C-alpha cells in the first residue's frame, strides 16, 4: 500500500494537489498529480485519512445502552470489529428536535 | 456539545437513522429522527466522528521532505494547530501515475 515516494521524485504540494515524477514499470518516467481533498480530512486539527461510509462497510447497526451506536465495521483488511460510539458527544436536544453540534 | 439522551427516551437506531422521543424547551414531547450517515464514518474498523473538508479548514500546506504533508488546521474550538500526515500510507505509484489505495 502506498509508498509512492520510494519510486517517485520532484514532488510538490499546491493546496490539496500532490504532483510527482514517478518511474514506469517498464522504464522511463511520468509526471502526474492527485487531489488529496477527497481522501484526507481535518479531525479536530489533525490531518487524517478519510474513512468509509458506515452503512456500506458495517453491519448490525443498533443502539447500545441509551445513547450509543454500535456495529461490526470492516477494517481496510476486511476483518470485522465490534465498535461503539457515544451519540451524546455531538447529538443534542434542541427544543425537541435532534441536532448535531 | 450534545447530551440528547438526558432529555429524550425510547431511542432507536434503524440503519444510519436515529429516532427519539424528546423533551421540548417549554413542555410536551417531540419525536425526531436524524441521519448519522454524514457525521459518523468507519475509520479502520472504528466508528468515529467525521471531520472537516481539509482545503476549507486548513492552510499553509507543504510537503515536508519526501512524503509528509504538513499544514495548519483549525480545531473544533477554531484555533490553528500544526499537523502532518504521511502520504506514503495510501498514495502509490501505479506504472508512473499517482493513485490512492
Swiss-Prot record, chains A, B:
Additional notes on this entry: Its activity in situ is unknown, however it acts as a viral entry inhibitor, inhibiting HIV-1, HIV-2 and simian immunodeficiency virus (and some other viruses such as feline immunodeficiency virus, measles virus and human herpesvirus) infection and replication. It prevents essential interactions between the envelope glycoprotein and target cell receptors by binding to carbohydrates on viral protein gp120 and possibly by other mechanisms as well. Addition to cells must occur before or shortly after virus addition.
Official protein name in the record: Cyanovirin-N
SUPFAM superfamilies: Cyanovirin-N
Name of one Pfam family that matches: CVNH
Quaternary data: In solution exists as a metastable domain-swapped homodimer which very slowly converts into a more stable monomeric form at room temperature. Under physiological conditions it is unlikely that the dimeric species exists and indeed the monomer is more active against HIV. Interacts with HIV-1 gp120.
Keyword Disulfide bond: yes
Alphabetical GO biological process terms: regulation of defense response to virus
Superkingdom of the organism of origin: Bacteria
PANTHER family the UniProt entry points to: CYANOVIRIN-N DOMAIN-CONTAINING PROTEIN, CYANOVIRIN-N HOMOLOG
Family, similarity comment: Belongs to the cyanovirin-N family.
Cystine bridges: 8-22, 58-73
General function of this protein: Mannose-binding lectin.
Matches recorded under SMART domains: CVNH
Species this chain originates from: Nostoc ellipsosporum
Post-translational modification: Cleavage, or reduction and alkylation of the disulfide bonds results in the loss of anti-HIV activity.
GO molecular function terms attached to this record: carbohydrate binding
Uses in industry and biotechnology: Overexpression of this protein to provide quantities adequate for medical use as a topical microbiocide has been attempted in a number of systems including E.coli, Lactobacillus jensenii, the yeast Pichia pastoris and Nicotiana tabacum; see PubMed:20162270 for a review.
Keyword tags: Antiviral protein, Disulfide bond, Lectin
Alphabetical list of InterPro entries matching this protein: Cyanovirin-N, Cyanovirin-N_sf
Signal peptide (UniProt feature, chain positions): none
Amino acid at each position: 500500500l502506498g509508498k509512492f515516494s520510494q519510486t517517485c521524485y520532484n514532488s510538490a504540494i499546491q493546496g490539496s494537489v500532490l504532483t510527482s515524477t514517478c518511474e514506469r514499470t517498464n522504464g522511463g518516467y511520468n509526471t502526474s498529480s492527485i487531489d488529496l481533498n477527497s481522501v484526507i480530512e481535518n479531525v479536530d486539527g489533525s490531518l487524517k485519512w478519510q474513512g468509509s461510509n458506515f452503512i456500506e462497510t458495517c453491519r448490525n447497526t443498533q443502539l447500545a445502552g441509551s445513547s450509543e451506536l454500535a456495529a461490526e465495521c470492516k477494517t481496510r483488511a476486511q476483518q470485522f470489529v465490534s465498535t461503539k460510539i457515544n451519540l451524546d458527544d455531538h447529538i443534542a436536544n434542541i427544543d425537541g428536535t435532534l441536532k448535531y453540534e
